[PDB]
Design a protein around this ligand. Sequence first.
Ligand SMILES: O=c1ccn([C@@H]2O[C@H](COP(=O)(O)OP(=O)(O)O[C@H]3O[C@H](CO)[C@@H](O)[C@H](O)[C@H]3O)[C@@H](O)[C@H]2O)c(=O)[nH]1
Ligand SMILES: O=c1ccn([C@@H]2O[C@H](COP(=O)(O)OP(=O)(O)O[C@H]3O[C@H](CO)[C@@H](O)[C@H](O)[C@H]3O)[C@@H](O)[C@H]2O)c(=O)[nH]1
Ligand SMILES: [Mg+2]
Ligand SMILES: [Mg+2]
Lengths: 278, 278
Amino acid sequence: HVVRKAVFPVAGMGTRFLPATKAMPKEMLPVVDKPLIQYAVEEAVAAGITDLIFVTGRNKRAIEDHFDAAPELETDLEAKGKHELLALVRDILPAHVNCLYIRQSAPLGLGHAVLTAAPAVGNEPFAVLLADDLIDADTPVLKQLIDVAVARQGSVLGVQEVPREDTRKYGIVASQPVDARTERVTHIVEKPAPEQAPTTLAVVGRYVLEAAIFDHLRATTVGAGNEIQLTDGIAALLRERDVYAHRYDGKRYDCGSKAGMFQATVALGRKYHGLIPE
Amino acid sequence: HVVRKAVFPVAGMGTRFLPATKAMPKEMLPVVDKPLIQYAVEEAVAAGITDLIFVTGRNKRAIEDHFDAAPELETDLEAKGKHELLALVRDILPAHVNCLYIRQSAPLGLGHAVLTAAPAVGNEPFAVLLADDLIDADTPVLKQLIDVAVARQGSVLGVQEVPREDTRKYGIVASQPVDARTERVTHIVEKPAPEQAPTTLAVVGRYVLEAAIFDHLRATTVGAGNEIQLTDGIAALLRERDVYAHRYDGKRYDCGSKAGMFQATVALGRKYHGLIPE
Ligand SMILES: O=c1ccn([C@@H]2O[C@H](COP(=O)(O)OP(=O)(O)O[C@H]3O[C@H](CO)[C@@H](O)[C@H](O)[C@H]3O)[C@@H](O)[C@H]2O)c(=O)[nH]1
Ligand SMILES: O=c1ccn([C@@H]2O[C@H](COP(=O)(O)OP(=O)(O)O[C@H]3O[C@H](CO)[C@@H](O)[C@H](O)[C@H]3O)[C@@H](O)[C@H]2O)c(=O)[nH]1
Ligand SMILES: [Mg+2]
Ligand SMILES: [Mg+2]
């Protein structure tokens, strides 16, 4: 049981961030000085991922141009003695890592986005990271989730308790503990109304999934908001396989919203840059 | 004496904001939900500019794709009934306004960037806006300078007093009053050491300029930081023609650094979005 490939769905419409997202996806929006996606990609590489798979929509070259080499810059910086910046540019992506780009025909849902990656993953377990869920942790959260998958030979979702008023935002897991941080998922519902949400334990955008999910996604139909939900492909996988929920150790920011991106800017400005509101 | 053309230099390397500025200019970095450049362009249109001139570099794609139409997006929105955003998307470039793109061969300086615009400006006075100086004013700051340029038939710089420790950041003007807010300029030096700065009156990135500057720029050689400076071209133009400095009324944030962009996010998030540090 080995995970070396990760999928980054970056093909949503990002309408919550117009006009900022007219020419770039929301996952290219920066927190201080780094795009959301590079945070997630850094986590995945730290977790052992070697093969990055990006599912693009509008402004696809924005992502491609960020992670592909730019020797016009690399040459220019190496000229001006700007050594620190230059290796900072290489630190964006280490040499061994590969990037490959697939196009989503339409933004038909998170689940349809992942199914799009099936030819690239092939038949092996794989990660999924939603970069709008920015997580700051001492140990990479994806490394946390993979360890669980190997031990228990099953899928793993990252999860945290949320307010019951916010369940229209998340897939909500009903589960039974196996250890202090891990539970086995027996039901999962996408964006339940607060009154019917089974629990308050919600899925964050960090997944480790067995290849079996793809067939369950080819059979998946539109659910919440008339979208093909990854959650509903996990719900079909549940009947057949083991799915776990792990309360990872780390701090998540809802950068899919203007308010949580503000808090990410404030918190991480202070932590990694020394920036304090005047 | 009419100013209808404005030049937007967006072709620097933006190294202070790497890695976010690998595939986009710093002027496409957002404050909450609007890129730095769109603030400045909105100001210019309010000030009467009809012709937008963008001087691009390597990362032209982000600037072009932001202000050029995206009927792929316009059509999806027209689908989802989102009337309000659709019009916010068309307003990015209002109906009366046109834009054109000319490219800087290499990031050789701000003055070289402006000289690149000479063919589009032709022979008439024109505005220049540096988008990393984001300004919040009850009356568009460039409109303040245009009125002064018209009145006194001359070039006009926006200026505000700064601490003498920050003189190394800006062009510094030596001048003599003409009225309470306006002075006649007698020298300007780029990034003087504080011990050598003649004054503490600094140039903000808003200019109204006569076409005579262009030949002064063809004759300008590298100065501060091995760059062709617009300031050194203005220092030559001073001797030949009238150059004015106006203490605009408004609140400037130097978003050209991580610190001033953070304080703009904090300040402007609170005022205009209700965003308050947790
Ligand atoms: O057609 C689509 C839809 C989405 N995305 C991407 O998929 C991710 C998720 O999209 P978003 O609209 O942010 O989904 P949410 O409403 O945030 O919901 C998802 O993510 C939550 C965690 O943030 C989970 O709780 C939910 O179960 C899950 O559906 C983002 O990276 C999008 O860019 C695509 O690429 N294509
Ligand atoms: O080769 C280049 C270099 C810069 N730029 C653009 O020019 C502007 C200025 O570049 P920056 O490095 O930000 O210059 P500063 O050191 O901020 O200095 C300028 O801006 C200050 C106010 O912000 C003034 O006080 C200074 O005199 C003036 O030179 C930015 O919008 C860049 O995009 C280009 O288009 N091409
Ligand atoms: Mg989301
Ligand atoms: Mg600047």
